[PDB]
Amino acid sequence: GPLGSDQYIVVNGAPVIPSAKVPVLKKALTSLFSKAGKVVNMEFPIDEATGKTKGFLFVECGSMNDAKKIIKSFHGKRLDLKHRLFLYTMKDVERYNSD
C-alpha cells in the first residue's frame, strides 16, 4: 500500500467463510480494531476455487502508532469460542516480497 511500511498489519486466525459474508466480517473487525487505533483499509484474500476467505487479512492503519496499539490490544486474543487472532507488523513480509 501507499502508506509507511510499519502501518500495515497481518491478522491471522480469522473465520473461513463464504466471501459473500466479508462485508459483515469486515465491519465487525473494523469496529473492534477501531477501539484501539485508526483503520484506513482492510482486505481479505479469497480462495478463488471455493469463494471462501482464507482466514487472514491485511490491515492498513492510520499511523505506525495506530498499528502498534491494534497489535497490542488484539494479538493472541480470542475473537470468539472458535477463533483466536494473531497480529504482526507487515513490514518484513512486504520487504521479503520486494527486497
Author numbering: 71 to 169
The authors write:
The largest of these factors, eIF3, is a multi-subunit complex consisting of five stoichiometric subunits in yeast (eIF3a, b, c, g and i). One of its large subunits, eIF3b, serves as a scaffold within eIF3 as it interacts with several other subunits. Here, by using X-ray crystallography we studied the structure of yeast eIF3b-RRM and showed that it corresponds to the canonical RNA recognition motif. The structure is composed of four β-strands and two α-helices which are arranged in a β-α-β-β-α-β sequential order.
The second construct encompassing residues 76–170 was designed to have an extra helix according to the secondary structure predictions. Two monomers in the asymmetric unit are held in place by interactions between their β-sheets and between each β-sheet and the extended α-helix of the neighboring chain. Comparison of the relative orientation of the monomers between eIF3b-RRM76–170 and eIF3b-RRM76–161 showed that chain B in eIF3b-RRM76–161 has been displaced by ∼9 Å relative to the same chain in eIF3b-RRM76–170.
